[PDB]
Paper text:
In this work we have determined the structure of SpvD, a S. typhimurium SPI-2 T3SS effector protein that inhibits the NF-κB signaling pathway. Structurally, SpvD can be classified as belonging to the CA clan of cysteine proteases that contains papain and related proteases (MEROPS peptidase database). Although SpvD is highly conserved among different serovars of S. enterica, serovars Typhimurium and Enteritidis differ in containing an arginine or glycine, respectively, at residue 161 near the active site.
After unsuccessful crystallization of wild-type SpvD, we obtained crystals of SpvD in which its predicted surface cysteines were mutated (SpvDC37S/C122S/C160S/C170S, hereafter referred to as SpvD4CS), and these diffracted to 1.5 Å resolution. Subsequent structure determination revealed that SpvD adopts an α+β fold with a total of 7 α-helices, 6 β-strands, and a short stretch of 310 helix. Its central core is composed of a β-sheet formed by four antiparallel β-strands (β3–6) surrounded by five α-helices (α3–7). Additionally, there is a smaller β-sheet (β1–2) surrounded by α-helices 1–5. Close inspection of a shallow groove on the protein surface between helices α4/α5, strand β4, and the β5-α7 loop revealed a potential hydrolase active site including a catalytic triad of cysteine (Cys-73), histidine (His-162), and aspartic acid (Asp-182). Therefore, the Arg-161 side chain could have an inhibitory steric or regulatory role in the activity of SpvD. Despite being less active in the DUB-GloTM assay, SpvDA154/R161 was the most active SpvD variant in the Ub-AML deconjugation assay. The fact that the SpvDR161 variant is present in all Salmonella serovars except Enteritidis, Bovismorbificans, and Abortus-equi is intriguing. It is possible that SpvDR161 has gained a different substrate specificity that is not related to NF-κB signaling.
Residue numbers in the entry: 8 to 39, 45 to 63, 72 to 94, 103 to 212
């Protein structure tokens, strides 16, 4: 798979309107197992390893999928997805709150055991700039004899890379859509 990334990122079959973006990605991206059942501490180490929020979140998603620390950073999510995964990842319908994101993810896990997702928020409050598009990650953690829970992961937000639901909710007002996507 990582060799397919290398082929895509260096290819000449690219619309020149996308050239600078692909170059920014190529410049940032580095290419170098974790257990099948991840722990919260595993996720912390993976989030630290990878660290632009769209690139970071896609890198982390990829690493989680392969259970290995492969991609890191040293942007249109469609272009990023095409490079890292080889296609755009299919999205959910728009969701209206981070609470609803959590519920949808728990439902997907309940039915299909799908456990790792990229979240795209429209009106995330970033420092200084305010409401803005922001990507981050969510993984379902299953600890012994405990109900599965959603761990949000924001590898960009280095002050708190594993926020609680309460903490991440601080970064939203009622303004905003959310979308969930995942590599299959
Ligand atoms: Na926070």
């Amino acid at each position: 798979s990582s060799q397919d990334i290398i082929s895509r990122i260096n290819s000449k079959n690219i619309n020149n309107n996308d050239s600078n973006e692909v170059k920014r990605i190529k410049d940032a991206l580095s290419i170098e197992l974790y257990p099948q059942n991840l722990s919260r501490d595993n996720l912390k180490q993976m989030a630290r390893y990878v660290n632009n929020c769209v690139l970071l979140s896609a890198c982390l998603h990829y690493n989680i999928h392969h259970r290995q620390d492969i991609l890191s950073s040293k942007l249109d999510s469609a272009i990023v997805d095409k490079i890292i995964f080889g296609h755009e990842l299919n999205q959910s319908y728009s969701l209206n709150s981070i609470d609803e994101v959590e519920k949808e993810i728990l439902n997907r896990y309940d039915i299909k055991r799908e456990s790792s997702f990229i979240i795209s928020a429209e009106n995330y409050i970033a420092p200084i700039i305010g409401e803005s598009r922001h990507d981050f990650n969510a993984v379902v953690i299953s600890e012994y004899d405990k109900k599965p829970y959603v761990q949000f992961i924001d590898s960009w937000k280095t002050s708190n890379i594993l926020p609680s639901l309460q903490e991440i909710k601080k970064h939203f007002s009622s303004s905003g859509e959310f979308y969930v996507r995942a590599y299959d």
